[PDB]
């Protein structure tokens, strides 16, 4: 997450921090972002789980904010189901079908209970996306620069603009490694962008003046690199898939 603000207690309450467990009593390691799309379901990126696709390796945190008091009873979740898209594949640079679903529960078996700091995010209407050039917002704990190694301590959000496939599929962009199950987004000034460690996190667009999960941070050459937008899994083309694994 390069070049944004730090979020607060009612900014991006659907954001989910996905951590990988370490052996022993070592604290866990931050692995990916994610979005609460149902009280029991978080959507993220498959490429985040392909090395260790067993649910036992992860723990999910919700309600993150500098003004929110951590309560492990309501904000920490075990993963009782880990579903990766069955046709997830890795290409030269791009991921295909880069989407995953995590079914979550607290230590007492409950789902996420809504609050000032925890809300679900709406899925888009089928095959419906905001127009290109819309302002979408991105969020994460990822690097604040391509060159930076340090990860930030607290949640950042920024604003990018949707980029058309025609513009994105130009050779000096990404050429044929973009398909229509992806969504490109960038800063027209190329100063703000998502980065390493934002993977699986939300791309939030308005659709009918409703905040909507239009994308899942998936990939990109560099971070905030001129002529090179962030590529997102286009959620509107996966709705059947999502609602087939839930309901």
């Amino acid at each position: 997450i390069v070049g944004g603000e730090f979020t607060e207690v009612e900014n991006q309450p659907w954001f989910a921090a996905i951590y990988q467990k370490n052996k022993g009593g070592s604290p866990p390691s931050f692995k990916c972002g994610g979005s609460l799309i149902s009280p029991c379901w978080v959507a993220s990126a498959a490429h985040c789980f392909i090395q260790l696709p067993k649910k036992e390796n992860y723990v999910v945190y919700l309600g993150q904010s500098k003004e929110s008091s951590y309560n492990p009873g309501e904000m920490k979740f075990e993963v009782e189901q880990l579903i990766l898209h069955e046709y997830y594949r890795e290409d030269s640079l791009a991921y295909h079908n880069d989407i995953a679903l995590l079914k979550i529960r607290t230590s007492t078996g409950q789902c996420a209970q809504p609050s000032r700091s925890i809300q679900t995010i709406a899925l888009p209407p089928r095959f419906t996306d905001a127009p290109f050039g819309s302002d979408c917002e991105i969020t994460g704990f990822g690097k604040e620069s391509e060159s930076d190694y340090l990860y930030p301590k607290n949640l950042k959000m920024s604003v990018v603009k949707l980029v058309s496939h025609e513009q994105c599929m130009q050779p000096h962009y990404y050429g044929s490694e973009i398909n229509y199950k992806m969504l490109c987004a960038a800063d027209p000034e190329w100063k703000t962008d998502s980065c390493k460690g934002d993977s699986g996190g939300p791309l939030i667009c308005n659709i009918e003046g409703r905040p909507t999960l239009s994308g899942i941070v998936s990939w990109g050459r560099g971070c905030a690199e001129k002529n090179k937008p962030g590529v997102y899994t286009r959620v509107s083309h996966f709705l059947d898939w999502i609602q087939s694994h839930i309901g």
Epitope: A17, G25, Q64, S65, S68, Y70, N71, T108, L155
Partner: nanobody
């Protein structure tokens, strides 16, 4: 092979003092926020007092304010609970619990303490504190 272990339980005269200690083995307790929780006969588990991993933040139940004092030694891998001016009402099983607080939250350990300890990762077997004539 991760273990939390309480010690210090016993039988003390009302108004007397008693110190509990929680020691860890198999891991570094210093990364973890620690809570002391107690279950009295008949009532449900309640947060007595809590402390953050660096020690900067503490929380106390209203019942024990000014009487109980939590502290820790991250060099020695321990957390202590000093209990002064003990009252019969304090008679209970005292448990030590440890939870890693992720980054991105408030500095407070208030919510960690007021919620009966649900979700705390690690728990000791508990030790007995009895206050009686």
């Amino acid at each position: 092979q991760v273990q939390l272990q309480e010690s210090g339980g016993g039988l003390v005269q009302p108004g007397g003092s008693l110190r509990l200690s929680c020691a860890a083995s198999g891991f570094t307790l210093g990364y973890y926020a620690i809570g002391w929780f107690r279950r009295a006969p008949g009532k449900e588990r309640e947060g007595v007092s809590c402390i953050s991993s660096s020690g900067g933040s503490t929380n106390y139940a209203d019942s024990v304010k000014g009487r109980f004092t939590i502290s820790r030694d991250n060099a020695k891998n321990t957390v202590d609970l000093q209990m002064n001016s003990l009252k019969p009402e304090d008679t209970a099983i005292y448990y030590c619990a440890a939870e890693w607080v992720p980054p991105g939250y408030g500095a407070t350990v208030q919510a960690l303490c007021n919620n009966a300890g649900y979700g705390m990762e690690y728990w000791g077997k508990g030790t007995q504190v009895t206050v009686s004539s």
